[PDB]
Amino acid sequence: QAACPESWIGFQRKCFYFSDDTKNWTSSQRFCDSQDADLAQVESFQELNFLLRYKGPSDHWIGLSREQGQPWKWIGECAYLNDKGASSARCYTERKWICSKSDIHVGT
Ligand SMILES: *[C@@H]1O[C@H](CO)[C@@H](O)[C@H](O)[C@H]1NC(C)=O
């Protein structure tokens, strides 16, 4: 059994932080790096669906990016979630973001 910090939201073993403000992709990653977290690393389809359902009507950066000629990689272009799925934009644009981290295990 497990918990998330109070401003974060839990979904199966992970915690996610949905931002108030907008940043570019690198400055969102810097922000998440502070929480010893990362721009959201979506490990499963169920997790993607969760973020799509929870996120609200704004675009949100996730931790997926691409150097030109090269494939998309999880932590050029950067990916965000819109209402239907993922899309790309230049990394200098300003969007809300999602951080992810493993949840806090509460030992017994
Ligand atoms: C993102 O914006 C920040 C301002 O917080 C700036 O320091 C950084 O260089 C920017 N990165 C870009 C424009 O790619």
Residue numbers in the entry: 72 to 146, 161 to 193
Reproduce the article's own wording on this structure.
The engagement of NKR-P1 on the NK cell with LLT1 on the target cell inhibits NK cell cytotoxicity and IFNγ production and contributes to NK self-tolerance in a similar way to the orthologous rodent NKR-P1B–Clr-b receptor–ligand pair.
The monomeric form keeps the same fold with the exception of the position of an outer part of the long loop region. There is an important difference in the placement of the outer loop (residues 147–160) of the long loop region (residues 137–160). In LLT1_mono, residues 147–160 (the outer loop of the long loop region) are poorly visible and were not built in the deposited structure. The crystal packing of LLT1_mono was investigated to confirm that the form of the protein in this structure is really monomeric and that no possible partner participating in oligomer formation can be found among the symmetry-related copies. The classical dimerization interface is left open to the solvent, without any crystal contacts. The monomeric form of LLT1 was crystallized at pH 3.5 and the changed protonation state at low pH corresponds with the changed preferred intermolecular contacts and the formation of oligomers. As an example, residue His190, localized near the C-terminus in the dimerization interface, is charged at low pH and destabilizes this part of the interface. Given that we observe standard dimers at pH 4.2 in the LLT1_glyco structure and only the extreme pH of 3.5 in LLT1_mono leads to dimer disruption, this direct observation of behaviour at extremely low pH is not relevant to normal biological limits.
